[PDB]
Structures are given as structure tokens and as C-alpha cells.
Amino acid sequence: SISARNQLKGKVVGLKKGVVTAEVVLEIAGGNKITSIISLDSVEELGVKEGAELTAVVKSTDVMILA
Amino acid sequence: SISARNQLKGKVVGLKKGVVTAEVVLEIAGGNKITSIISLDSVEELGVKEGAELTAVVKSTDVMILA
Amino acid sequence: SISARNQLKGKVVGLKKGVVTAEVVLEIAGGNKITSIISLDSVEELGVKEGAELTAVVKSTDVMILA
Amino acid sequence: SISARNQLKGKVVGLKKGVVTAEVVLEIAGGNKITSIISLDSVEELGVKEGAELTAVVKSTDVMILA
Amino acid sequence: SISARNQLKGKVVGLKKGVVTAEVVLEIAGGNKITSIISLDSVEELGVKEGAELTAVVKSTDVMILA
Amino acid sequence: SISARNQLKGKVVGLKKGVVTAEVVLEIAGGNKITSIISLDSVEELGVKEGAELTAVVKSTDVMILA
Ligand SMILES: [Cl-]
Ligand SMILES: [Cl-]
Ligand SMILES: [Cl-]
Ligand SMILES: [Cl-]
Ligand SMILES: [Cl-]
Ligand SMILES: [Cl-]
Ligand SMILES: [Cl-]
Ligand SMILES: [Cl-]
Ligand SMILES: [Cl-]
Ligand SMILES: [Mg+2]
Ligand SMILES: [Mg+2]
């Protein structure tokens, strides 16, 4: 459990591993998708796998707002 | 359109203006909220106000995963 | 057409595809080069290729200022 | 030198100070402008003021592409 | 349990509040200091104050290398 | 030499090269580790290698604070 303001729970629906990074796609409430690129080491350490229930976290200063 | 893979449509449910930045809270589908800190100039340009329909845009490399 | 304050129009002069990401190099006005690392999926979806006229976009909070 | 691939020399054409941050607008070559939100402490350390010659530094993973 | 590979424990040695954000300086092990600009909301939720033990969390793609 | 507020000197203890990016792990004072993902081009241009003494740099707005 953490205090971060932006926490979106979802289910992993896609995982593509590279050499240094990995792309994780999560389906969140309503069904919308969140895509994350993290280190491959983290995928392994956190045991990220298709179907896993995980949470996407984003610092507020990284959220752009467009029309 | 734009390369950022996370484009979440939502409505403004919170707005706090500073002098250089502003904090905007959007309610997206499924009831999740996402908070953004952006420049006050962008707030003015988009006419951000309570109820406005806007899009939160996040690069995949800015999304962390919490297990 | 977007409202983002930082928009730099340029021509793709370099493209290197990885497994998860891709590196895109744009020559902007005057000749300055801008390098972007985006997801490979975006390269494909946006149809990014050598010679294409595209625009680089950057959130203001990601711009460091040095001497 | 530094790893950030985007190092854009420019002159300060806009400056707005907050208490924690500041907004700095640089005019780079070819007439493009780039806006940055940085800590007020950095503004003071660099002596940021209108006309100052500074460098905007952006990591490639923070550059989005708009097609 | 979070993917960000940089998790640096430290104590608060500086705190400056704005209206939307706050600047927090943490002294980590070995005497290094790290400065963060975060939302004022987070400062209040974590009870940030001088001496507080907190963790600075940084995504690997946000770390530049200077040679 | 640069003015950036966050500069953490360290020794490269890990290096993994991908096609577009590379993962650099630095042991900083106290012995703790900082992980950076930069472009492969930069590794080559800066001559980054195991054992090298380098400095990690982070913009303050990219530093999240957690309990
Ligand atoms: Cl895979
Ligand atoms: Cl993206
Ligand atoms: Cl911004
Ligand atoms: Cl290629
Ligand atoms: Cl870079
Ligand atoms: Cl900053
Ligand atoms: Cl990371
Ligand atoms: Cl924040
Ligand atoms: Cl290697
Ligand atoms: Mg980033
Ligand atoms: Mg950022």
C-alpha cells in the first residue's frame, strides 16, 4: 500500500519483453488500457505476467492535459 | 495522432491554480481519478474549469507498476 | 492540431527500431536535431518513417535548464 | 558532457517566478520557442533573466511525436 | 513492490511550500542530498516535516548520466 | 561541471546494452545503487563502461516522495 495520488488498478492484458525494458498493458476499470514501459529487471523481480492484477502509478507532474 | 499511448478522457472534478502551475483532477471512465500538475498557461488556453471534458495524456515510460 | 506549448516541427532524419521502443531523430528549423524514444507500437500506428514531417512535443516540466 | 540527447541553446524571452518554481521561455535557433517549468532555486543559481543565453535539456524519452 | 528502480531512503532537511507544489530536500545515506518538487497534497498526506524519514523514488528513464 | 541540484557521483557496477537504450547501474556513496536507462548512442559517445566514475543527474520534478 502506498500514498501516491494516481493509482489505477488493472489486469495485465499484454506483456512484451525487450532486452532492457518491457512493455506492460493493463486493462483498467471500464476496460480502458494503460501502457507502461519499465525495466526488464522489474518485470522479473515483481513477477509481472499476463492476467496479473497490478496497479499503475503516475506522478502528477507527468500528466499532460489536452482537449 | 500523438505517440503517448495513454490518453484518458475525463471530466474536471478539481482545480487549484497556483501562479506558475495548476492542479487539475480528472474523473475518467470507471470512476478512477487522475491528478495532473500543469502550467497555469495551459489551464487558461484550454479554458479548464469544473466539468470540462479533457484528456489526460501520459507517456508509457512515466507509468510505474505497483505489485 | 493540439494546444501544447512546446511543438517543434521537423523532418525525420533517423529511425532505429528496437523490440519495445524506437529512436526517432528529427531535424528542426535551423537544423537543430531532436531525438525521441517512443514505443515501437507508435512508430507503426503513426506510420513514422525517414523523411516524414512530424512534430516533437514536450511537457514543460520535463525541460531542464542548464548554463 | 551529459546523456540527454536534446540540448537546445537559446535566449530567455519570458520569465515568470512562483515561490517553488519558475516558468522560463527560451527562443532557440530558427525561431522556435521552448517553455520550461523549473525550480526557483535553479533560476537563481543560473542568474536567469531576460536575454540570458541558456540551454534547454530534454531526455529523449520525454519527447512525444505528433503526426 | 514498485517498479521504480531508484528508492533512496532519507530524512527531510529542507521544506518549502508553494500553493500547488512543495520542494522537499532529503539527505540520503552517504551524505548526498536529493531535491524533489511534488504536490502540496502529497506533502500534507505524508505529514512531511523536517526530520521525517521518507523515500525518494525515481524511474530509471529519468536518470541522466554526466561524464 | 554543471549547476543541476541533484548530482550523485558513483561508479558504474552494471551495464546492459539494448538496441535503442542501455541500462547503467551506479554504486553511489554509502554503496547504494542508482539505475539509469539512457540511449545506446550516449553510452557510446560518453564512453560509459564498467568501473567508470560518473554522475547521475535527476530533474527535481521527477522525484516522487513515498513513505
Ligand atoms: Cl515477450
Ligand atoms: Cl508512450
Ligand atoms: Cl507543464
Ligand atoms: Cl531500424
Ligand atoms: Cl536522452
Ligand atoms: Cl525542477
Ligand atoms: Cl525504473
Ligand atoms: Cl507531483
Ligand atoms: Cl551488454
Ligand atoms: Mg520521464
Ligand atoms: Mg518526467
Side-chain angles (χ1 to χ4, degrees):
Chain A
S1 186
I2 66 172
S3 79
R5 205 56 55 41
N6 294 327
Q7 295 190 47
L8 307 177
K9 299 183 182 90
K11 180 173 189 74
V12 177
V13 294
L15 178 61
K16 180 167 64 178
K17 294 177 181 183
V19 164
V20 170
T21 60
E23 183 186 317
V24 185
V25 184
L26 302 186
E27 170 204 349
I28 63 170
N32 196 333
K33 307 185 175 326
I34 291 288
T35 300
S36 172
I37 292 172
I38 57 176
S39 74
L40 181 69
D41 290 337
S42 294
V43 161
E44 304 177 341
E45 301 195 358
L46 298 182
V48 178
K49 295 185 179 205
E50 278 191 352
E53 296 174 353
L54 300 169
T55 300
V57 179
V58 185
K59 193 177 185 291
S60 62
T61 44
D62 288 330
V63 182
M64 292 189 76
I65 295 295
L66 292 186
Chain B
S1 193
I2 198 164
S3 62
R5 304 281 310 163
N6 303 295
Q7 298 175 24
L8 317 171
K9 289 170 173 179
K11 60 172 179 189
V12 175
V13 293
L15 177 58
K16 181 178 73 170
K17 304 184 175 185
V19 162
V20 161
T21 55
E23 183 185 85
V24 181
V25 184
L26 294 188
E27 177 176 334
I28 63 179
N32 277 125
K33 310 213 173 187
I34 190 172
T35 297
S36 164
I37 287 175
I38 56 169
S39 75
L40 179 65
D41 290 344
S42 296
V43 148
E44 311 184 321
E45 181 179 341
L46 298 176
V48 181
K49 61 177 174 176
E50 296 290 347
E53 297 174 336
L54 299 166
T55 302
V57 178
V58 184
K59 295 170 287 291
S60 303
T61 45
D62 285 337
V63 180
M64 291 164 289
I65 293 294
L66 169 68
Chain C
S1 162
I2 67 173
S3 82
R5 289 283 178 177
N6 295 327
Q7 296 189 46
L8 305 174
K9 296 181 204 174
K11 184 177 188 69
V12 177
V13 293
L15 178 61
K16 183 166 69 179
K17 298 175 178 184
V19 169
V20 169
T21 57
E23 181 190 308
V24 184
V25 182
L26 305 183
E27 168 201 356
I28 62 169
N32 264 312
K33 293 194 176 184
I34 288 290
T35 301
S36 170
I37 289 171
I38 58 173
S39 74
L40 182 70
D41 293 341
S42 292
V43 163
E44 304 175 338
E45 301 185 357
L46 300 184
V48 175
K49 52 205 33 158
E50 189 143 11
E53 293 173 355
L54 299 168
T55 298
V57 181
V58 183
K59 192 178 187 292
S60 65
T61 43
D62 285 332
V63 184
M64 168 167 289
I65 293 299
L66 293 184
Chain D
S1 50
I2 202 162
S3 64
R5 302 291 297 173
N6 304 294
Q7 297 178 26
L8 315 169
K9 304 304 155 166
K11 59 176 180 185
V12 174
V13 293
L15 176 60
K16 185 170 82 168
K17 297 177 178 182
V19 288
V20 167
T21 56
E23 185 187 76
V24 181
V25 185
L26 295 186
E27 178 174 335
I28 62 181
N32 275 126
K33 304 288 176 46
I34 191 169
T35 296
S36 160
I37 286 173
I38 57 168
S39 79
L40 182 62
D41 290 338
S42 297
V43 152
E44 309 180 329
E45 170 79 15
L46 293 176
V48 183
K49 66 174 79 172
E50 295 289 348
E53 294 177 337
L54 300 168
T55 302
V57 178
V58 184
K59 296 172 286 289
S60 301
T61 44
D62 284 339
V63 179
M64 293 166 287
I65 294 296
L66 168 69
Chain E
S1 296
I2 197 168
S3 64
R5 301 285 297 180
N6 302 294
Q7 298 181 24
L8 316 169
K9 295 169 188 162
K11 58 172 181 187
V12 176
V13 292
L15 177 58
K16 187 178 68 166
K17 291 170 178 182
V19 164
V20 160
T21 60
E23 183 186 79
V24 183
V25 185
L26 289 165
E27 177 172 336
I28 62 179
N32 277 128
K33 285 147 202 281
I34 190 172
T35 296
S36 163
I37 284 174
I38 54 166
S39 74
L40 181 57
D41 269 76
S42 291
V43 148
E44 305 296 359
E45 293 178 4
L46 291 171
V48 179
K49 65 180 172 192
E50 295 289 348
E53 293 178 341
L54 300 166
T55 304
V57 179
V58 186
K59 296 170 285 293
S60 301
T61 44
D62 284 339
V63 180
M64 292 165 287
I65 295 294
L66 171 68
Chain F
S1 187
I2 66 169
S3 70
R5 193 135 181 238
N6 294 326
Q7 297 190 43
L8 305 176
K9 296 178 178 187
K11 179 177 192 74
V12 176
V13 292
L15 179 61
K16 181 167 70 179
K17 297 180 178 174
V19 162
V20 169
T21 57
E23 185 184 341
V24 185
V25 183
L26 299 185
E27 168 202 352
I28 62 170
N32 292 161
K33 306 173 189 325
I34 293 293
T35 301
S36 168
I37 289 172
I38 58 174
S39 73
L40 183 66
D41 292 335
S42 293
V43 163
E44 302 178 335
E45 302 197 6
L46 301 180
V48 173
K49 47 206 23 166
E50 276 243 353
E53 295 175 349
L54 298 169
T55 298
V57 179
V58 183
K59 191 176 187 293
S60 65
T61 44
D62 288 330
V63 183
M64 290 185 74
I65 295 297
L66 291 184

Coordinates of all heavy atoms in Angstrom, one line a residue, chain B residues 1-5 21 36-39 41-42 45-46 59-62, chain C residues 2-5 21 36-39 41-42 45-46 57 59-62:
Chain B
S1 N -2.0 10.1 -34.6 CA -2.3 11.3 -33.8 C -1.0 11.6 -32.9 O 0.0 12.1 -33.4 CB -3.5 11.1 -32.9 OG -4.0 12.3 -32.4
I2 N -1.0 11.3 -31.6 CA 0.1 11.5 -30.8 C 0.7 10.2 -30.3 O -0.1 9.2 -30.0 CB -0.1 12.6 -29.6 CG1 1.2 13.1 -29.1 CG2 -1.0 12.0 -28.5 CD1 1.1 14.4 -28.2
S3 N 2.0 10.2 -30.1 CA 2.6 8.9 -29.7 C 2.3 8.4 -28.3 O 2.4 7.2 -28.0 CB 4.1 9.0 -29.9 OG 4.7 10.0 -29.0
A4 N 2.0 9.3 -27.4 CA 1.7 8.9 -26.0 C 0.6 7.8 -26.0 O -0.5 8.1 -26.4 CB 1.4 10.1 -25.1
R5 N 0.9 6.7 -25.5 CA -0.1 5.6 -25.5 C -1.2 5.7 -24.5 O -2.2 5.0 -24.7 CB 0.7 4.2 -25.3 CG 1.8 3.9 -26.4 CD 1.4 3.5 -27.7 NE 0.4 2.4 -27.7 CZ -0.3 2.1 -28.7 NH1 -0.1 2.8 -29.9 NH2 -1.1 1.1 -28.7
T21 N 1.8 27.1 -11.9 CA 1.1 25.8 -12.3 C -0.3 25.8 -11.8 O -0.7 26.7 -11.1 CB 1.9 24.7 -11.7 OG1 1.9 24.8 -10.3 CG2 3.3 24.6 -12.1
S36 N -3.3 15.9 -12.2 CA -2.2 16.5 -13.1 C -1.7 17.8 -12.6 O -2.5 18.6 -12.1 CB -2.8 16.8 -14.5 OG -2.0 17.6 -15.2
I37 N -0.4 18.0 -12.7 CA 0.1 19.4 -12.3 C 0.6 19.9 -13.7 O 1.5 19.3 -14.2 CB 1.2 19.3 -11.3 CG1 0.5 19.1 -9.9 CG2 1.9 20.7 -11.2 CD1 1.4 18.9 -8.8
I38 N 0.1 21.0 -14.2 CA 0.4 21.5 -15.5 C 0.6 23.0 -15.4 O 0.4 23.6 -14.3 CB -0.7 21.3 -16.5 CG1 -2.1 21.8 -16.0 CG2 -0.8 19.8 -16.8 CD1 -3.2 21.8 -17.0
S39 N 1.1 23.7 -16.4 CA 1.3 25.1 -16.3 C 0.0 25.8 -16.3 O -1.0 25.4 -16.9 CB 2.1 25.6 -17.5 OG 1.3 25.7 -18.7
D41 N -0.6 28.5 -17.7 CA -0.9 29.0 -19.1 C -1.7 27.9 -19.9 O -2.6 28.3 -20.7 CB 0.4 29.3 -19.8 CG 1.1 30.5 -19.3 OD1 0.4 31.3 -18.6 OD2 2.3 30.8 -19.5
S42 N -1.5 26.7 -19.7 CA -2.2 25.6 -20.4 C -3.7 25.6 -19.9 O -4.6 25.5 -20.6 CB -1.6 24.2 -20.2 OG -0.3 24.2 -20.8
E45 N -5.4 28.4 -21.6 CA -5.6 28.2 -23.0 C -6.7 27.2 -23.4 O -7.4 27.3 -24.4 CB -4.2 27.7 -23.6 CG -4.1 27.3 -25.0 CD -2.8 26.9 -25.4 OE1 -1.8 27.1 -24.7 OE2 -2.6 26.2 -26.5
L46 N -6.8 26.1 -22.5 CA -7.9 25.1 -22.7 C -9.2 25.5 -22.1 O -10.2 24.9 -22.3 CB -7.4 23.8 -22.1 CG -6.2 23.3 -22.8 CD1 -5.7 22.0 -22.1 CD2 -6.5 23.0 -24.3
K59 N 3.0 9.5 -21.1 CA 3.9 8.6 -21.8 C 4.1 7.3 -21.0 O 4.1 7.3 -19.8 CB 5.3 9.3 -21.8 CG 5.2 10.6 -22.7 CD 6.5 11.5 -22.6 CE 6.6 12.2 -21.2 NZ 5.6 13.3 -21.1
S60 N 4.2 6.2 -21.8 CA 4.3 4.9 -21.1 C 5.5 4.8 -20.2 O 5.5 4.1 -19.2 CB 4.5 3.8 -22.2 OG 3.4 3.8 -23.1
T61 N 6.6 5.5 -20.5 CA 7.8 5.4 -19.7 C 7.6 6.2 -18.3 O 8.5 6.1 -17.5 CB 9.1 6.0 -20.4 OG1 8.7 7.2 -21.0 CG2 9.5 5.1 -21.5
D62 N 6.5 6.9 -18.2 CA 6.2 7.5 -16.9 C 5.2 6.7 -16.1 O 4.8 7.2 -15.0 CB 5.6 8.9 -17.1 CG 6.6 9.9 -17.5 OD1 7.9 9.7 -17.2 OD2 6.4 11.0 -18.1
Chain C
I2 N -3.0 20.5 -31.8 CA -3.1 20.5 -30.3 C -2.7 21.8 -29.7 O -2.1 22.6 -30.4 CB -2.3 19.3 -29.7 CG1 -0.8 19.5 -29.9 CG2 -2.8 18.0 -30.3 CD1 0.0 18.5 -29.2
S3 N -3.0 22.0 -28.4 CA -2.7 23.2 -27.7 C -1.4 23.3 -27.0 O -1.0 24.3 -26.5 CB -3.8 23.5 -26.7 OG -3.5 22.7 -25.5
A4 N -0.7 22.1 -26.9 CA 0.6 22.1 -26.2 C 1.5 23.3 -26.5 O 1.8 23.6 -27.6 CB 1.3 20.8 -26.5
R5 N 2.1 23.8 -25.5 CA 3.0 25.0 -25.7 C 4.3 24.6 -26.4 O 4.8 25.5 -27.2 CB 3.4 25.6 -24.3 CG 2.2 26.4 -23.7 CD 1.9 27.7 -24.3 NE 0.8 28.4 -23.7 CZ 0.4 29.6 -24.0 NH1 1.0 30.3 -25.0 NH2 -0.7 30.2 -23.5
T21 N 10.9 -0.3 -28.0 CA 10.9 1.2 -28.3 C 11.6 1.4 -29.6 O 12.1 0.5 -30.3 CB 11.7 2.0 -27.3 OG1 13.0 1.4 -27.2 CG2 11.2 1.7 -25.9
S36 N 13.9 11.4 -30.0 CA 12.7 11.0 -29.3 C 12.8 9.4 -29.1 O 13.2 8.8 -30.1 CB 11.5 11.3 -30.0 OG 10.3 10.7 -29.5
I37 N 12.5 8.9 -28.0 CA 12.4 7.4 -27.8 C 10.9 7.2 -27.5 O 10.4 7.6 -26.4 CB 13.4 6.9 -26.8 CG1 14.8 7.0 -27.4 CG2 13.0 5.4 -26.4 CD1 15.8 6.7 -26.4
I38 N 10.2 6.5 -28.4 CA 8.8 6.2 -28.2 C 8.6 4.7 -28.4 O 9.5 4.0 -28.6 CB 7.9 6.9 -29.3 CG1 8.4 6.6 -30.7 CG2 8.0 8.4 -29.1 CD1 7.5 7.2 -31.8
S39 N 7.4 4.2 -28.1 CA 7.1 2.8 -28.3 C 7.1 2.4 -29.8 O 6.8 3.2 -30.6 CB 5.8 2.4 -27.7 OG 4.7 2.9 -28.5
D41 N 5.1 0.4 -31.1 CA 3.8 0.4 -31.5 C 3.4 1.7 -32.1 O 2.6 1.8 -33.1 CB 2.8 0.1 -30.3 CG 3.0 -1.3 -29.7 OD1 3.5 -2.2 -30.4 OD2 2.5 -1.6 -28.6
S42 N 3.9 2.8 -31.5 CA 3.5 4.1 -32.0 C 4.1 4.4 -33.4 O 3.5 5.1 -34.2 CB 3.9 5.2 -31.0 OG 3.2 5.1 -29.9
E45 N 1.8 2.6 -35.7 CA 0.5 3.2 -35.7 C 0.5 4.6 -36.4 O -0.5 5.0 -37.1 CB -0.1 3.2 -34.3 CG -0.3 1.8 -33.8 CD -1.0 1.8 -32.4 OE1 -1.3 2.9 -31.9 OE2 -1.2 0.7 -31.9
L46 N 1.5 5.4 -36.1 CA 1.6 6.8 -36.6 C 2.3 6.7 -38.0 O 2.3 7.8 -38.6 CB 2.4 7.7 -35.7 CG 1.9 7.9 -34.3 CD1 2.8 9.0 -33.6 CD2 0.4 8.4 -34.3
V57 N 6.8 17.1 -29.3 CA 6.1 17.7 -28.2 C 6.7 17.4 -26.9 O 7.0 16.2 -26.6 CB 4.6 17.3 -28.3 CG1 3.8 18.0 -27.2 CG2 3.9 17.6 -29.6
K59 N 6.4 18.2 -22.6 CA 5.8 18.8 -21.4 C 6.8 19.8 -20.8 O 7.9 19.4 -20.6 CB 5.3 17.8 -20.4 CG 4.3 18.4 -19.3 CD 3.8 17.3 -18.4 CE 2.8 17.8 -17.4 NZ 3.3 18.8 -16.4
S60 N 6.3 21.0 -20.4 CA 7.3 22.0 -19.9 C 8.0 21.6 -18.6 O 9.2 22.0 -18.4 CB 6.6 23.4 -19.7 OG 5.6 23.3 -18.7
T61 N 7.4 20.8 -17.8 CA 8.1 20.3 -16.6 C 9.2 19.3 -16.8 O 9.9 19.0 -15.9 CB 7.1 19.6 -15.6 OG1 6.2 18.8 -16.3 CG2 6.2 20.7 -14.9
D62 N 9.3 18.8 -18.1 CA 10.4 17.9 -18.4 C 11.6 18.6 -19.0 O 12.6 18.0 -19.4 CB 10.0 16.9 -19.5 CG 9.0 15.8 -18.9 OD1 9.2 15.5 -17.7 OD2 8.2 15.3 -19.6

